Amino acid sequence: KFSKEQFDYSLYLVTDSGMIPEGKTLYGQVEAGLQNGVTLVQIREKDADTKFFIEEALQIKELCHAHNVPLIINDRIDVAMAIGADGIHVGQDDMPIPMIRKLVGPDMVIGWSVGFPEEVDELSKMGPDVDYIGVGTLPTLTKKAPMGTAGAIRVLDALERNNAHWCRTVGIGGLHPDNIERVLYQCVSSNGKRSLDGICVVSDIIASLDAAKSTKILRGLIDKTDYKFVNIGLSTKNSLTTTDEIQSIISNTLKARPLVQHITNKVHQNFGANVTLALGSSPIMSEIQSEVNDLAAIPHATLLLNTGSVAPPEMLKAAIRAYNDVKRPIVFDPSATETRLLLNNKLLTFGQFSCIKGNSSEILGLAELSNELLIQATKIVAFKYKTVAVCTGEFDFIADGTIEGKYSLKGTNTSVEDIPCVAVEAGPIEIMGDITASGCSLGSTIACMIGGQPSEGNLFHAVVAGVMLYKAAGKIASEKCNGSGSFQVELIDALYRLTRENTPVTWAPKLTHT
Amino acid sequence: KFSKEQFDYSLYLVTSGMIPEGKTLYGQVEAGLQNGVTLVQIREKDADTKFFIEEALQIKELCHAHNVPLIINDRIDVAMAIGADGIHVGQDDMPIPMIRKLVGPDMVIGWSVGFPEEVDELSKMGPVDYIGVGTLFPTLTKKAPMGTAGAIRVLDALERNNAHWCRTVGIGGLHPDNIERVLYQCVSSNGKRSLDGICVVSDIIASLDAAKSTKILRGLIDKTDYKFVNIGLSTKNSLTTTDEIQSIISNTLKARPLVQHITNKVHQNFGANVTLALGSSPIMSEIQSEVNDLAAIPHATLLLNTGSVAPPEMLKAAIRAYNDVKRPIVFDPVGYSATETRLLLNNKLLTFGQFSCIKGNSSEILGLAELSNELLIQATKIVAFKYKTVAVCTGEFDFIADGTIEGKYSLSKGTNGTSVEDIPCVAVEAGPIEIMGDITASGCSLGSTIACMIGGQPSEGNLFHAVVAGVMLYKAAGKIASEKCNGSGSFQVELIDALYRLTRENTPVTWAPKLTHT
Amino acid sequence: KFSKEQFDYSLYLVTSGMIPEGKTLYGQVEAGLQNGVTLVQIREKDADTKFFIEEALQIKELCHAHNVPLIINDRIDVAMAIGADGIHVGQDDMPIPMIRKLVGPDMVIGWSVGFPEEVDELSKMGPVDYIGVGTLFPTLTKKAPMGTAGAIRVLDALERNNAHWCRTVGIGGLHPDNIERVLYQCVSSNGKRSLDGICVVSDIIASLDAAKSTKILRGLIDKTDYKFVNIGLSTKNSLTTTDEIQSIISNTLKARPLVQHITNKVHQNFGANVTLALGSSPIMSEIQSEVNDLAAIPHATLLLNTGSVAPPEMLKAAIRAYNDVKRPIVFDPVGYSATETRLLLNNKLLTFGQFSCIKGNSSEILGLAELSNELLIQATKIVAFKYKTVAVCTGEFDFIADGTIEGKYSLSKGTNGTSVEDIPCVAVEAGPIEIMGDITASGCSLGSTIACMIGGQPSEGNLFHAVVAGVMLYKAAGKIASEKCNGSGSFQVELIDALYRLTRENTPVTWAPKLTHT
Ligand SMILES: Nc1ncnc2c1ncn2[C@@H]1O[C@H](COP(=O)(O)OP(=O)(O)CP(=O)(O)O)[C@@H](O)[C@H]1O
């Protein structure tokens, strides 16, 4: 009675009978949903009696059809048939798809639980006879290892690579108002052609004291089309960064005197601090959870996040969340050891970053494995994490992956290949890499530059401005130094003087299009 | 029959469940009455109101035999029953006027007070006869421990409210290791009122030799002089002379003071270099087990920066380790007054010991003063006095106040005419040098310099002069570096060089900063 | 302002921690004041003496609105503070004269009393205004529960000491399942004084419908008639006539009463045979789960022997199961008064329910009377009255007293002129027959006979007449057997035969024993 094409995956509610609040029933929760924006319902009973199960399925089936929304069973095939369900959801260890299809006929919708690209290959070597997948666990407690959006993207990419046009996708696992826009936003195919088809919740709706309210919320999120994660203009700029724009950037940050919280390694503490206040803004080296919220609330707080520090992931997660809660900029600086690959992928799941900064090695790791290769790898990373990426080296490349904060359910009509990407070169300056925390301190610089921008500011321009400034100041130091030692002290001086006489026309570095 | 005026709160004993075997409540109370308790309160929060009465009638006779009144606790009826000399209650025990209604005047009524809001009621009631002030330090015998700073808030409310009838005693956590500091730094902001006595339970009641324990408290209480650091604390009206500054520097180069740094990461290296630029040696140890043997070293000195990763446990242990040995501590409360979290931590640290010097920027010093240039001078004097300390407020002008009053303390007097408003407060300035604030831990490194100067001081030295010596020096070195530098980066290397050069030739006659009365 | 005389202790409510959710102390107390509490005491053994005061002032107004005084607890100062109507204390709370000294006269003073020794002091004090008497039954809200027997000891001390000023209320464990028995059997030995009221906490405070709970207690309390067994209890001055005895036997042969035996092992078989000799049926079940359905059976009757292996748990359950259904219980306290152990067990059993008849030899009856022939007659009357029961004292003469007073009870009155000394007490004798005591459970089997006689009685029957009927019968059968026997062994088989023959032809005109007024 429902054709495969009539299934709206927008907000897909999946039940759990033993998590409902008192003075509330499954029928009661599933009805609020239906009146506030649920479009697909699945009945889940991993333990209940096969007969209670049936009586329950039948009563909710009436309900769903009342509002004209189908009903799915995960994953009782026989029950699904018995009650004549609209579809069924099975997983990687339940009943194989062919057997099922052989029992239910081609017209019923079959969902599969997928958390790996290999499973999309399998799905596609079965033809259009699997109709949707729920992408892995993005960490829930409703279960009894989470992959993040990065993990979702690999799965989306495998659909696109295999052109499994027939298969829809919903995200699931962990999903609440605090990660949902980030999930819609950064969960798109690399070619930008295919995004998530809808969103799955259990706890957010089922275990709610007000299901009607909780649903309206997820609705707002889902059918909204724009995610301002940072209070700085994300506008797309195809023109190079003019000397007036750079100059306006620097005026701004001297005036605002941004606050740049540094969570970072030991070696980068003093240097990173001095760079910051050489840029006429102030730095806190706080690593205390109790504090992060107060710090983020300060008028121009900016977080520079540097990996390999000793701080617990818990503190890092709360920090990232505090800055995102306040729409304040985070600059991320991260794969040489398995331990670091773990920790970094994990932080990348905690939040929405304003800018990601690394060298050739780190950017190629994040891109998922020359000079054109770097410009490719830099555009991937920017797009993957919807961020401004920066690849250091002789030439610094800077890609804008933000896409103006746009998300939809169709992807973004723009890809990993055609985002704006510029370059900044000032000749060879090998000595810049013979000094410790160089890229760390480029990070401090970027943060201060992003720190000072107002609502009408521009994110991309401020990162470029920051890269120019740092390169310009490294050219000047290389000329005035007598070795490593004096180079670093010349660098800070050069940064101090350059911004104190804010006159970009003068600087050495040359800004081109990649 | 005692009159309210005849009460001597000097050493106020509060009494059971925590008595040592082979000993009696009666025995201990007698031990204290013989070697020093001028007032006894009976506290039996769990006993049968029949046993309570028997116990109380027994001890009322013991007390009265030494001419010391007896005060009952959460119980106005036991106190009438046995004809007690007074009763003590809390904010949740029986309202005071009701109490007064049953017992009539001429019976002393004590109240438990931890906050100024309560002193306000105390006053809207007119002539409540004494109060025990909050629980200063964590006891084990409602609200959390507030330390002298919370005591002081309450003494000031009495003063503001002109509640002259009301006496005060301090209570909670009070032992030989904190009494003289509690008595020394618990005085009203106007120098006019201090604690009237000190109140103990576990220090005597739970004592194996309660006779010894009491004599110790008695000495502590009726002494008037708190030598917290082995360096002279005499008051100095005369500007610090070039001869003196030259003698400080000499003395520190010679002593070569061990300077233990407990400080954020950004300061570690800078501060270590400033330290051995001044011809002493730094140690960056954050290890509890070491602190004791570290501070035993001749001329040891502790610079304490807040924010520092260290657990409040080790911090308490260090502070006490230096106070235990009478070595100076320099406290720098980082923008503490910036987040509720740092406010908490510094306030707690400030209850752990006596600091020689407290150093901070304008924001911090206005915070600690429990909130221009006169205002900064008013604030610096408040901090100096509040914590009985040499406070330094850094800025274009550095301000240095001396709140130590020569280590003097008395009961109830409470100060030899010395208010928040008239401790000596000098000034140091060498023009605008904005660049000193464009390099990290400028103030932390100021702290290193002060520590070294204070560090090398002899028994006959002067704490105040050494703090000023070190601010002159640091400012003199900053003036020079700002001339020779080409930006932030080189400013810092010159700052160290300048300190290195300046102290290798004590010729302060040469330095650039101007030292003046405020 | 109430005068001591205006206090109505009828239903005395004592108040917190055990309140049902969605309900307030205030609400419950109001529920009770509306549907029956004539006095409220406030009890807050753990609250802050400030909250206590607030709570008490609030409820004093509630009370006073219904014209019922408020009494405070372990607290004489809260009670002066708020101007309470009285205060209640214990043996370990504040001594009474001190209390009187502070509150003056005109404030009611209650005392907790569990023992006569305490009533003695109460009296050596003269005019303490009321007492709550011990903790009768095990409560969950010092000394152990004493039941009515312990209450009675205290009422007698008041009487002996002529302490007329002092009122009494019963307290502890008091619920609908024991109130009418406590009120019925808690009267002085001279019939002149009974409880003045009944006192509850958990029955109302912890009630989901405290309005219902109170009305139930009110009915119970102001009724005057306790129908504990479904057989008439009218007082009988006239000897039991041969026509009557013949009607008892008829009635029991017809009813064919189920007689449940809980009894030592030596009696099981003998007692079972005596039972079906009398044309009824015995059951020897000692099983808790059965007791309820067993006693539901028409004409069910319970013979309860002490010593019996059974756990006091099952015994309590049985006793209550028969009282719950108003079926008779015959209690035989085996030489209980022989060992502290049996004394304990029987005293406890005696607190579990109401017995129709209590039967014992001389030793036992003198024990239960809480200690010749007149003496045995004085004792049998005491036991009968003490337990509000038909008591039988077996010997050469069997004595039968009737202490039931027709089920009547009142508050404080306390009896329609009926003392330990003038309940009807008859006598039964057929000469010396020493051989009746040379066979085991002679007395236990007497109990079987009584049970059957009582067993078959109708609604309109008479309890007393049936007990005498059965003693005549048993004695008549013993006379015959002693003639036909050749020693102990055959005596027993003839005793049964004689009972079998005697009841197959009710011709009591024929029997040998003589029934006479005492
Ligand atoms: N060979 C080179 N020529 C010119 N500039 C260079 C350079 N190598 C590095 N830089 C400059 O230094 C910055 C970052 O370079 P890079 O990322 O390779 O250092 P890094 O990542 O190893 C820092 P860390 O030591 O903390 O790991 C840029 O501003 C860049 O222009």
Ligand SMILES: Nc1ncnc2c1ncn2[C@@H]1O[C@H](COP(=O)(O)OP(=O)(O)CP(=O)(O)O)[C@@H](O)[C@H]1O
């Ligand atoms: N405008 C000015 N003119 C002259 N000296 C100045 C100055 N501003 C700061 N200084 C110098 O720098 C020191 C104090 O630094 P300040 O109190 O302003 O910041 P701060 O205490 O927070 C340092 P940190 O970076 O460790 O937080 C003093 O030695 C002082 O004389």
Ligand SMILES: Nc1ncnc2c1ncn2[C@@H]1O[C@H](COP(=O)(O)OP(=O)(O)CP(=O)(O)O)[C@@H](O)[C@H]1O
């Ligand atoms: N001297 C006597 N003359 C006539 N009858 C006597 C008698 N002594 C006992 N009896 C009869 O025996 C019964 C009471 O027994 P008794 O009270 O003397 O011992 P007892 O109650 O302890 C029995 P058990 O063996 O179960 O402990 C009565 O029915 C009574 O009439």
Ligand SMILES: Cc1ncc(C[n+]2csc(CCOP(=O)(O)O)c2C)c(N)n1
């Ligand atoms: C369509 C579909 N995709 C996946 C699964 C498996 N699954 C993975 S996570 C999760 C619990 C999340 O609850 P919460 O949102 O409260 O964290 C479930 C039920 C499924 N049953 N159906």
Ligand SMILES: [Mg+2]
């Ligand atoms: Mg790097």
Ligand SMILES: [Mg+2]
């Ligand atoms: Mg500072």
Ligand SMILES: [Mg+2]
């Ligand atoms: Mg017997």
